PDB file of C-alpha atoms and ligand atoms in Angstrom:
ATOM      1  CA  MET A   1      79.699  19.226 -54.286  1.00 44.20           C
ATOM      2  CA  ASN A   2      79.014  18.575 -50.579  1.00 44.58           C
ATOM      3  CA  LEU A   3      76.522  21.082 -49.212  1.00 45.59           C
ATOM      4  CA  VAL A   4      74.465  21.741 -46.094  1.00 47.23           C
ATOM      5  CA  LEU A   5      71.577  24.193 -45.952  1.00 47.20           C
ATOM      6  CA  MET A   6      70.552  25.639 -42.589  1.00 45.46           C
ATOM      7  CA  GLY A   7      68.018  28.225 -41.478  1.00 43.87           C
ATOM      8  CA  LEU A   8      65.120  28.903 -39.131  1.00 46.24           C
ATOM      9  CA  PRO A   9      61.747  27.259 -39.850  1.00 42.14           C
ATOM     10  CA  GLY A  10      60.344  28.572 -43.127  1.00 43.82           C
ATOM     11  CA  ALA A  11      63.473  30.476 -44.171  1.00 44.44           C
ATOM     12  CA  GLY A  12      63.436  28.786 -47.566  1.00 46.27           C
ATOM     13  CA  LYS A  13      65.843  25.854 -47.435  1.00 46.13           C
ATOM     14  CA  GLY A  14      63.630  23.711 -49.626  1.00 45.01           C
ATOM     15  CA  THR A  15      62.908  26.447 -52.121  1.00 42.95           C
ATOM     16  CA  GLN A  16      66.608  27.162 -52.640  1.00 43.33           C
ATOM     17  CA  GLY A  17      67.618  23.515 -52.475  1.00 42.45           C
ATOM     18  CA  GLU A  18      65.335  22.504 -55.320  1.00 43.83           C
ATOM     19  CA  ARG A  19      67.068  25.139 -57.476  1.00 46.56           C
ATOM     20  CA  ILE A  20      70.503  23.826 -56.516  1.00 46.25           C
ATOM     21  CA  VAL A  21      69.638  20.212 -57.378  1.00 46.39           C
ATOM     22  CA  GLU A  22      68.239  21.187 -60.785  1.00 46.20           C
ATOM     23  CA  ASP A  23      71.494  22.950 -61.655  1.00 47.68           C
ATOM     24  CA  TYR A  24      73.874  20.354 -60.172  1.00 49.41           C
ATOM     25  CA  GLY A  25      72.004  17.043 -60.180  1.00 50.26           C
ATOM     26  CA  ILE A  26      72.979  16.107 -56.628  1.00 47.17           C
ATOM     27  CA  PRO A  27      70.435  14.409 -54.338  1.00 48.32           C
ATOM     28  CA  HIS A  28      68.374  16.717 -52.116  1.00 49.21           C
ATOM     29  CA  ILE A  29      68.434  15.096 -48.649  1.00 51.15           C
ATOM     30  CA  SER A  30      65.958  16.650 -46.186  1.00 50.59           C
ATOM     31  CA  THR A  31      65.519  14.888 -42.879  1.00 47.22           C
ATOM     32  CA  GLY A  32      62.113  16.472 -42.522  1.00 45.13           C
ATOM     33  CA  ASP A  33      61.060  14.946 -45.855  1.00 47.45           C
ATOM     34  CA  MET A  34      62.462  11.574 -44.801  1.00 48.73           C
ATOM     35  CA  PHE A  35      60.478  11.685 -41.561  1.00 49.90           C
ATOM     36  CA  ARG A  36      57.254  12.622 -43.359  1.00 50.99           C
ATOM     37  CA  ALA A  37      57.801   9.865 -45.946  1.00 53.97           C
ATOM     38  CA  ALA A  38      58.256   7.432 -43.057  1.00 56.57           C
ATOM     39  CA  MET A  39      55.041   8.591 -41.437  1.00 58.35           C
ATOM     40  CA  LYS A  40      53.187   8.273 -44.739  1.00 55.75           C
ATOM     41  CA  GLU A  41      54.447   4.710 -45.217  1.00 55.83           C
ATOM     42  CA  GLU A  42      53.634   3.930 -41.574  1.00 56.40           C
ATOM     43  CA  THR A  43      57.108   2.642 -40.699  1.00 58.79           C
ATOM     44  CA  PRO A  44      58.635   2.176 -37.239  1.00 58.23           C
ATOM     45  CA  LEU A  45      60.740   5.275 -37.955  1.00 54.23           C
ATOM     46  CA  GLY A  46      57.597   7.215 -38.724  1.00 54.46           C
ATOM     47  CA  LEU A  47      56.002   6.156 -35.483  1.00 51.57           C
ATOM     48  CA  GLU A  48      59.086   7.176 -33.503  1.00 56.40           C
ATOM     49  CA  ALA A  49      59.449  10.584 -35.135  1.00 57.83           C
ATOM     50  CA  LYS A  50      55.784  11.625 -35.245  1.00 55.60           C
ATOM     51  CA  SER A  51      55.585  12.474 -31.513  1.00 56.34           C
ATOM     52  CA  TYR A  52      58.375  15.045 -31.702  1.00 58.01           C
ATOM     53  CA  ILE A  53      57.380  16.381 -35.114  1.00 57.99           C
ATOM     54  CA  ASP A  54      53.784  17.038 -34.037  1.00 62.13           C
ATOM     55  CA  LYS A  55      55.055  19.039 -31.060  1.00 62.84           C
ATOM     56  CA  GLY A  56      57.588  20.957 -33.129  1.00 62.54           C
ATOM     57  CA  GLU A  57      60.368  19.349 -31.080  1.00 61.85           C
ATOM     58  CA  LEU A  58      63.585  17.903 -32.486  1.00 61.50           C
ATOM     59  CA  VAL A  59      63.555  14.157 -33.215  1.00 58.97           C
ATOM     60  CA  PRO A  60      66.359  12.600 -31.101  1.00 58.55           C
ATOM     61  CA  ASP A  61      69.895  12.805 -32.385  1.00 58.12           C
ATOM     62  CA  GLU A  62      70.556   9.051 -32.379  1.00 55.74           C
ATOM     63  CA  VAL A  63      67.811   7.979 -34.772  1.00 57.15           C
ATOM     64  CA  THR A  64      68.300  11.098 -36.914  1.00 56.49           C
ATOM     65  CA  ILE A  65      72.052  10.608 -37.279  1.00 57.91           C
ATOM     66  CA  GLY A  66      71.395   6.979 -38.115  1.00 58.69           C
ATOM     67  CA  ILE A  67      69.105   7.588 -41.063  1.00 57.91           C
ATOM     68  CA  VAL A  68      71.416  10.281 -42.444  1.00 56.67           C
ATOM     69  CA  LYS A  69      74.477   7.981 -42.201  1.00 58.47           C
ATOM     70  CA  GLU A  70      72.587   5.297 -44.090  1.00 60.70           C
ATOM     71  CA  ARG A  71      71.228   7.726 -46.676  1.00 61.53           C
ATOM     72  CA  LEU A  72      74.595   9.285 -47.445  1.00 63.71           C
ATOM     73  CA  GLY A  73      76.009   5.814 -48.065  1.00 64.11           C
ATOM     74  CA  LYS A  74      73.829   5.365 -51.133  1.00 60.91           C
ATOM     75  CA  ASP A  75      75.259   5.277 -54.645  1.00 66.13           C
ATOM     76  CA  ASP A  76      73.370   8.390 -55.705  1.00 64.02           C
ATOM     77  CA  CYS A  77      75.580  10.274 -53.237  1.00 61.24           C
ATOM     78  CA  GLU A  78      79.019   9.278 -54.526  1.00 61.95           C
ATOM     79  CA  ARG A  79      78.961  12.408 -56.701  1.00 59.60           C
ATOM     80  CA  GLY A  80      77.989  14.898 -53.985  1.00 59.93           C
ATOM     81  CA  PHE A  81      74.851  15.837 -52.027  1.00 63.10           C
ATOM     82  CA  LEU A  82      72.704  18.550 -50.530  1.00 62.05           C
ATOM     83  CA  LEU A  83      71.776  18.148 -46.844  1.00 61.29           C
ATOM     84  CA  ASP A  84      68.749  20.187 -45.810  1.00 61.92           C
ATOM     85  CA  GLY A  85      67.711  20.597 -42.176  1.00 64.11           C
ATOM     86  CA  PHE A  86      70.548  18.361 -40.989  1.00 63.21           C
ATOM     87  CA  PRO A  87      72.501  18.907 -38.978  1.00 62.89           C
ATOM     88  CA  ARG A  88      70.526  21.249 -36.736  1.00 62.29           C
ATOM     89  CA  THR A  89      72.358  20.664 -33.436  1.00 64.43           C
ATOM     90  CA  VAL A  90      76.082  20.783 -32.591  1.00 63.16           C
ATOM     91  CA  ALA A  91      75.925  17.059 -31.772  1.00 64.01           C
ATOM     92  CA  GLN A  92      74.582  16.288 -35.260  1.00 63.02           C
ATOM     93  CA  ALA A  93      77.296  18.477 -36.807  1.00 67.43           C
ATOM     94  CA  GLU A  94      80.078  16.626 -34.954  1.00 65.32           C
ATOM     95  CA  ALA A  95      78.556  13.335 -36.030  1.00 63.52           C
ATOM     96  CA  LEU A  96      78.372  14.501 -39.666  1.00 63.20           C
ATOM     97  CA  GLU A  97      82.065  15.396 -39.579  1.00 67.71           C
ATOM     98  CA  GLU A  98      82.917  11.790 -38.612  1.00 71.09           C
ATOM     99  CA  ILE A  99      80.539  10.307 -41.151  1.00 75.65           C
ATOM    100  CA  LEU A 100      81.943  12.330 -44.034  1.00 74.53           C
ATOM    101  CA  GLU A 101      85.516  11.230 -43.364  1.00 74.97           C
ATOM    102  CA  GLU A 102      84.263   7.649 -43.639  1.00 73.29           C
ATOM    103  CA  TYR A 103      82.572   8.256 -46.997  1.00 74.64           C
ATOM    104  CA  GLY A 104      85.442  10.568 -47.941  1.00 75.11           C
ATOM    105  CA  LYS A 105      83.204  13.544 -48.770  1.00 74.21           C
ATOM    106  CA  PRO A 106      83.970  16.656 -46.606  1.00 74.56           C
ATOM    107  CA  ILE A 107      81.671  19.710 -46.620  1.00 74.24           C
ATOM    108  CA  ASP A 108      82.257  22.448 -49.177  1.00 75.40           C
ATOM    109  CA  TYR A 109      79.787  24.962 -47.729  1.00 74.71           C
ATOM    110  CA  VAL A 110      77.183  25.249 -44.997  1.00 71.96           C
ATOM    111  CA  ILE A 111      74.798  27.839 -46.410  1.00 71.02           C
ATOM    112  CA  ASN A 112      72.814  29.710 -43.788  1.00 75.06           C
ATOM    113  CA  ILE A 113      69.599  31.234 -45.180  1.00 73.37           C
ATOM    114  CA  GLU A 114      68.882  34.204 -42.903  1.00 71.39           C
ATOM    115  CA  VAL A 115      65.323  35.525 -42.536  1.00 72.12           C
ATOM    116  CA  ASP A 116      63.924  37.613 -39.659  1.00 74.17           C
ATOM    117  CA  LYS A 117      62.303  35.350 -37.042  1.00 74.74           C
ATOM    118  CA  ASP A 118      59.343  37.729 -36.858  1.00 74.60           C
ATOM    119  CA  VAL A 119      58.256  37.088 -40.476  1.00 74.67           C
ATOM    120  CA  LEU A 120      58.535  33.294 -40.437  1.00 75.76           C
ATOM    121  CA  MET A 121      55.062  32.631 -39.062  1.00 80.52           C
ATOM    122  CA  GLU A 122      53.580  34.259 -42.175  1.00 81.96           C
ATOM    123  CA  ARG A 123      55.934  32.171 -44.352  1.00 81.00           C
ATOM    124  CA  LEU A 124      54.571  29.007 -42.778  1.00 81.96           C
ATOM    125  CA  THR A 125      50.871  29.719 -42.294  1.00 83.54           C
ATOM    126  CA  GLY A 126      50.694  30.709 -45.948  1.00 80.03           C
ATOM    127  CA  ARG A 127      52.628  27.681 -47.128  1.00 78.83           C
ATOM    128  CA  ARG A 128      51.094  24.891 -49.173  1.00 80.42           C
ATOM    129  CA  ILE A 129      52.931  21.637 -49.911  1.00 80.33           C
ATOM    130  CA  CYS A 130      52.480  19.183 -52.788  1.00 80.39           C
ATOM    131  CA  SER A 131      51.166  15.835 -51.541  1.00 80.63           C
ATOM    132  CA  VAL A 132      52.975  14.187 -54.466  1.00 78.76           C
ATOM    133  CA  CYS A 133      56.488  15.649 -54.724  1.00 76.15           C
ATOM    134  CA  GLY A 134      56.913  17.694 -51.561  1.00 78.63           C
ATOM    135  CA  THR A 135      57.711  20.989 -53.310  1.00 74.63           C
ATOM    136  CA  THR A 136      56.305  24.081 -51.631  1.00 75.74           C
ATOM    137  CA  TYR A 137      54.274  27.146 -52.640  1.00 74.97           C
ATOM    138  CA  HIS A 138      53.019  30.206 -50.779  1.00 74.23           C
ATOM    139  CA  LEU A 139      49.576  31.810 -51.219  1.00 72.00           C
ATOM    140  CA  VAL A 140      51.201  35.217 -51.650  1.00 71.19           C
ATOM    141  CA  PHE A 141      54.962  34.771 -52.121  1.00 72.46           C
ATOM    142  CA  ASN A 142      55.053  31.927 -54.634  1.00 74.71           C
ATOM    143  CA  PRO A 143      51.593  30.797 -55.681  1.00 75.16           C
ATOM    144  CA  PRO A 144      50.883  27.717 -57.787  1.00 72.79           C
ATOM    145  CA  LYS A 145      49.672  28.457 -61.323  1.00 71.46           C
ATOM    146  CA  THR A 146      46.318  26.923 -60.425  1.00 73.93           C
ATOM    147  CA  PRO A 147      44.979  27.068 -56.827  1.00 73.91           C
ATOM    148  CA  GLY A 148      44.979  23.717 -55.018  1.00 75.69           C
ATOM    149  CA  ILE A 149      47.358  21.796 -57.318  1.00 76.99           C
ATOM    150  CA  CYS A 150      51.097  21.440 -57.972  1.00 72.28           C
ATOM    151  CA  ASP A 151      52.487  22.975 -61.195  1.00 71.96           C
ATOM    152  CA  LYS A 152      54.652  19.953 -61.808  1.00 72.03           C
ATOM    153  CA  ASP A 153      52.361  16.997 -61.220  1.00 77.48           C
ATOM    154  CA  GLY A 154      48.822  18.153 -60.454  1.00 76.97           C
ATOM    155  CA  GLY A 155      48.969  16.763 -56.921  1.00 77.98           C
ATOM    156  CA  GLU A 156      46.736  18.312 -54.276  1.00 77.76           C
ATOM    157  CA  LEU A 157      48.410  21.001 -52.170  1.00 77.99           C
ATOM    158  CA  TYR A 158      47.836  20.919 -48.422  1.00 75.34           C
ATOM    159  CA  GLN A 159      48.979  22.614 -45.202  1.00 77.60           C
ATOM    160  CA  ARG A 160      51.739  20.746 -43.416  1.00 75.32           C
ATOM    161  CA  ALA A 161      50.596  19.482 -40.019  1.00 72.84           C
ATOM    162  CA  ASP A 162      53.279  21.313 -38.079  1.00 69.79           C
ATOM    163  CA  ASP A 163      52.660  24.643 -39.830  1.00 71.17           C
ATOM    164  CA  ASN A 164      49.930  25.594 -37.348  1.00 71.55           C
ATOM    165  CA  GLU A 165      50.582  28.668 -35.199  1.00 72.80           C
ATOM    166  CA  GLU A 166      51.043  26.729 -31.957  1.00 72.49           C
ATOM    167  CA  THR A 167      53.554  24.270 -33.410  1.00 72.14           C
ATOM    168  CA  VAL A 168      55.468  26.949 -35.357  1.00 71.05           C
ATOM    169  CA  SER A 169      55.995  28.821 -32.079  1.00 70.09           C
ATOM    170  CA  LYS A 170      57.588  25.738 -30.604  1.00 69.74           C
ATOM    171  CA  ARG A 171      59.652  25.123 -33.746  1.00 69.89           C
ATOM    172  CA  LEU A 172      60.997  28.655 -33.722  1.00 67.36           C
ATOM    173  CA  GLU A 173      61.823  28.437 -30.015  1.00 66.25           C
ATOM    174  CA  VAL A 174      63.596  25.080 -30.300  1.00 66.93           C
ATOM    175  CA  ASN A 175      65.661  25.931 -33.326  1.00 68.66           C
ATOM    176  CA  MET A 176      66.596  29.461 -32.333  1.00 69.53           C
ATOM    177  CA  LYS A 177      68.266  27.925 -29.266  1.00 69.28           C
ATOM    178  CA  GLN A 178      70.339  25.764 -31.596  1.00 70.68           C
ATOM    179  CA  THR A 179      71.242  28.513 -34.093  1.00 72.18           C
ATOM    180  CA  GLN A 180      74.198  30.360 -32.548  1.00 73.18           C
ATOM    181  CA  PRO A 181      76.029  27.137 -31.556  1.00 75.16           C
ATOM    182  CA  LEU A 182      75.741  25.742 -35.080  1.00 77.45           C
ATOM    183  CA  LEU A 183      76.933  29.010 -36.680  1.00 77.54           C
ATOM    184  CA  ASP A 184      79.914  29.159 -34.335  1.00 77.78           C
ATOM    185  CA  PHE A 185      80.732  25.522 -35.109  1.00 78.63           C
ATOM    186  CA  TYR A 186      80.813  26.002 -38.869  1.00 80.11           C
ATOM    187  CA  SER A 187      82.292  29.494 -38.790  1.00 78.47           C
ATOM    188  CA  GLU A 188      85.295  28.035 -36.988  1.00 78.68           C
ATOM    189  CA  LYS A 189      85.460  25.183 -39.509  1.00 76.91           C
ATOM    190  CA  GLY A 190      85.339  27.853 -42.197  1.00 77.38           C
ATOM    191  CA  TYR A 191      82.483  26.217 -44.136  1.00 76.43           C
ATOM    192  CA  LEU A 192      79.872  28.883 -43.328  1.00 75.98           C
ATOM    193  CA  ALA A 193      78.324  31.375 -45.735  1.00 75.76           C
ATOM    194  CA  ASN A 194      75.336  33.500 -44.688  1.00 74.08           C
ATOM    195  CA  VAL A 195      72.843  34.563 -47.359  1.00 71.63           C
ATOM    196  CA  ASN A 196      69.985  37.059 -46.904  1.00 70.66           C
ATOM    197  CA  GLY A 197      66.920  34.960 -47.605  1.00 71.02           C
ATOM    198  CA  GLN A 198      64.374  37.753 -47.047  1.00 71.12           C
ATOM    199  CA  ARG A 199      64.213  38.823 -50.687  1.00 68.91           C
ATOM    200  CA  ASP A 200      62.736  37.523 -53.918  1.00 72.05           C
ATOM    201  CA  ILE A 201      63.479  33.829 -54.518  1.00 74.08           C
ATOM    202  CA  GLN A 202      65.580  34.681 -57.582  1.00 75.04           C
ATOM    203  CA  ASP A 203      67.735  37.264 -55.813  1.00 71.82           C
ATOM    204  CA  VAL A 204      68.426  34.719 -53.107  1.00 71.44           C
ATOM    205  CA  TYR A 205      69.264  31.987 -55.563  1.00 72.57           C
ATOM    206  CA  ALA A 206      71.558  34.301 -57.526  1.00 72.59           C
ATOM    207  CA  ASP A 207      73.749  34.765 -54.443  1.00 75.74           C
ATOM    208  CA  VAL A 208      73.739  31.018 -53.794  1.00 78.35           C
ATOM    209  CA  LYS A 209      74.710  30.276 -57.412  1.00 79.14           C
ATOM    210  CA  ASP A 210      77.581  32.705 -56.981  1.00 78.23           C
ATOM    211  CA  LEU A 211      78.940  30.634 -54.093  1.00 80.91           C
ATOM    212  CA  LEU A 212      78.537  27.284 -55.813  1.00 85.16           C
ATOM    213  CA  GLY A 213      80.205  28.616 -58.941  1.00 85.14           C
ATOM    214  CA  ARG A 214      83.427  28.842 -56.914  1.00 84.74           C
ATOM    215  CA  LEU A 215      83.626  25.090 -56.298  1.00 88.15           C
ATOM    216  CA  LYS A 216      85.292  22.716 -58.753  1.00 86.90           C
TER     217      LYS A 216
HETATM  218  N1  LIG B   1      68.098  17.115 -38.254  1.00 84.81           N
HETATM  219  C1  LIG B   1      66.974  16.986 -37.530  1.00 84.81           C
HETATM  220  N2  LIG B   1      67.098  16.672 -36.189  1.00 84.81           N
HETATM  221  C2  LIG B   1      66.030  16.517 -35.355  1.00 84.81           C
HETATM  222  N3  LIG B   1      64.768  16.673 -35.842  1.00 84.81           N
HETATM  223  C3  LIG B   1      64.558  16.980 -37.147  1.00 84.81           C
HETATM  224  C4  LIG B   1      65.663  17.142 -38.009  1.00 84.81           C
HETATM  225  N4  LIG B   1      65.273  17.443 -39.239  1.00 84.81           N
HETATM  226  C5  LIG B   1      63.935  17.478 -39.203  1.00 84.81           C
HETATM  227  N5  LIG B   1      63.505  17.195 -37.937  1.00 84.81           N
HETATM  228  C6  LIG B   1      62.098  17.124 -37.456  1.00 84.81           C
HETATM  229  O1  LIG B   1      61.246  17.401 -38.582  1.00 84.81           O
HETATM  230  C7  LIG B   1      60.498  18.611 -38.409  1.00 84.81           C
HETATM  231  C8  LIG B   1      60.367  19.292 -39.771  1.00 84.81           C
HETATM  232  O2  LIG B   1      61.725  19.534 -40.291  1.00 84.81           O
HETATM  233  P1  LIG B   1      61.897  20.433 -41.636  1.00 84.81           P
HETATM  234  O3  LIG B   1      61.030  19.881 -42.679  1.00 84.81           O
HETATM  235  O4  LIG B   1      63.326  20.345 -42.011  1.00 84.81           O
HETATM  236  O5  LIG B   1      61.538  21.790 -41.029  1.00 84.81           O
HETATM  237  P2  LIG B   1      62.159  23.158 -41.189  1.00 84.81           P
HETATM  238  O6  LIG B   1      63.586  23.135 -40.858  1.00 84.81           O
HETATM  239  O7  LIG B   1      61.410  23.955 -40.216  1.00 84.81           O
HETATM  240  O8  LIG B   1      61.992  23.811 -42.551  1.00 84.81           O
HETATM  241  P3  LIG B   1      60.764  24.060 -43.430  1.00 84.81           P
HETATM  242  O9  LIG B   1      60.524  22.995 -44.380  1.00 84.81           O
HETATM  243  O10 LIG B   1      59.544  24.190 -42.638  1.00 84.81           O
HETATM  244  O11 LIG B   1      61.035  25.317 -44.264  1.00 84.81           O
HETATM  245  P4  LIG B   1      62.050  25.556 -45.393  1.00 84.81           P
HETATM  246  O12 LIG B   1      63.173  26.334 -44.938  1.00 84.81           O
HETATM  247  O13 LIG B   1      62.342  24.425 -46.282  1.00 84.81           O
HETATM  248  O14 LIG B   1      61.168  26.473 -46.311  1.00 84.81           O
HETATM  249  P5  LIG B   1      60.402  26.423 -47.687  1.00 84.81           P
HETATM  250  O15 LIG B   1      61.386  26.460 -48.816  1.00 84.81           O
HETATM  251  O16 LIG B   1      59.375  25.337 -47.619  1.00 84.81           O
HETATM  252  O17 LIG B   1      59.629  27.813 -47.602  1.00 84.81           O
HETATM  253  C9  LIG B   1      58.602  28.110 -46.614  1.00 84.81           C
HETATM  254  C10 LIG B   1      57.531  28.976 -47.252  1.00 84.81           C
HETATM  255  O18 LIG B   1      58.129  30.214 -47.651  1.00 84.81           O
HETATM  256  C11 LIG B   1      57.990  30.440 -49.064  1.00 84.81           C
HETATM  257  N6  LIG B   1      59.259  31.035 -49.528  1.00 84.81           N
HETATM  258  C12 LIG B   1      60.424  30.441 -49.820  1.00 84.81           C
HETATM  259  N7  LIG B   1      61.356  31.326 -50.203  1.00 84.81           N
HETATM  260  C13 LIG B   1      60.735  32.503 -50.140  1.00 84.81           C
HETATM  261  C14 LIG B   1      61.274  33.785 -50.437  1.00 84.81           C
HETATM  262  N8  LIG B   1      62.545  34.002 -50.843  1.00 84.81           N
HETATM  263  N9  LIG B   1      60.388  34.831 -50.282  1.00 84.81           N
HETATM  264  C15 LIG B   1      59.103  34.664 -49.876  1.00 84.81           C
HETATM  265  N10 LIG B   1      58.620  33.434 -49.596  1.00 84.81           N
HETATM  266  C16 LIG B   1      59.413  32.335 -49.720  1.00 84.81           C
HETATM  267  C17 LIG B   1      57.684  29.109 -49.660  1.00 84.81           C
HETATM  268  O19 LIG B   1      56.878  29.204 -50.818  1.00 84.81           O
HETATM  269  C18 LIG B   1      56.928  28.391 -48.531  1.00 84.81           C
HETATM  270  O20 LIG B   1      55.515  28.665 -48.514  1.00 84.81           O
HETATM  271  C19 LIG B   1      61.306  19.380 -37.361  1.00 84.81           C
HETATM  272  O21 LIG B   1      60.537  20.368 -36.737  1.00 84.81           O
HETATM  273  C20 LIG B   1      61.795  18.233 -36.461  1.00 84.81           C
HETATM  274  O22 LIG B   1      60.709  17.833 -35.599  1.00 84.81           O
HETATM  275 MG1  LIG B   2      61.877  22.000 -46.146  1.00 86.76          MG
HETATM  276 ZN1  LIG B   3      54.233  18.216 -56.912  1.00 89.44          ZN
END
């Protein structure tokens, strides 16, 4: 199963992707997570990406395409994969098309998780992330069993650096500009499937499961 999840900041790509990987065992590849892991490990990649990430701007296509090409070439991906947050520009989509021919693994679906732009700020300012595994919670919409710690591993939950109001505004602006072009690109390819992500997590996942159940 070759999948791509797309959506505006805070729409719920990670929340739905974790559910997909637990049902299908494919690797969950999020470029955002890769960038934050790089920053945490203080690598050259982390240094390069941090500037854009802190501003809520897109990390340049070249370096981003490069780490995805490398990542998809790993053995854990020979049985399928779940891209999350990549591609997010038409240029990245065209590049992904080329890359997948190489690794002989064309896209089955590009799932677009649609949530009103006006309710995303609340999704992000109320978000808490696990410092250990990266899973996310929400103070109101999906709270951890115990405040301050992850259900799975007890790690401390914190607020992602770019989830501040100022940065979210830039993130929304930047990605909204990229949204129609990406939808048009995949609609034409026929890989696109829009899902209403502004409902309970389970209702959203049910619709997603429906789609994936159609693939061999
Ligand atoms: N390809 C690329 N090219 C260039 N630059 C790139 C790049 N990829 C990454 N970058 C750089 O990296 C930065 C960060 O990228 P990235 O980490 O990919 O940012 P993002 O796309 O904005 O997505 P988010 O992680 O913020 O949200 P999400 O959709 O996963 O939502 P979640 O499930 O956590 O949910 C959010 C909250 O909502 C809650 N929630 C989830 N579902 C629901 C629901 N159904 N109902 C109510 N609440 C819900 C959750 O509990 C949580 O609190 C970018 O800004 C850019 O600088
Ligand atoms: Mg995410
Ligand atoms: Zn955790």
